[PDB]
Amino acid sequence: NITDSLSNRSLIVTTILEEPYVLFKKSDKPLYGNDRFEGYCIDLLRELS
Ligand SMILES: *[C@@H]1O[C@H](CO)[C@@H](O[C@@H]2O[C@H](CO)[C@@H](O)[C@H](O)[C@H]2NC(C)=O)[C@H](O)[C@H]1NC(C)=O
Structure with a gap:
């Protein structure tokens, strides 16, 4: 286990x-923390979490 x-x-x-790995989220609202980023390694961090 x-x-x-x-x-x-x-x-x-x-x-x-770095653009293909991290990116600011395409939203007009000012996000905070880990909502401010998206991309490939962000999804890796989500899956590892
Ligand atoms: C830290 O993590 C542990 C396990 O990952 C959590 O464990 C349980 O805590 C309760 C309350 O004391 C115990 O009755 C259980 O026996 C514990 N589980 C195991 C498997 O021993 C613990 O709650 C976490 N601490 C926090 C959230 O503050």
């Missing part, structure tokens, strides 16, 4: 604005 062993941990993740 390789489930949520790191469940209570909180991590800080740094990225650089």
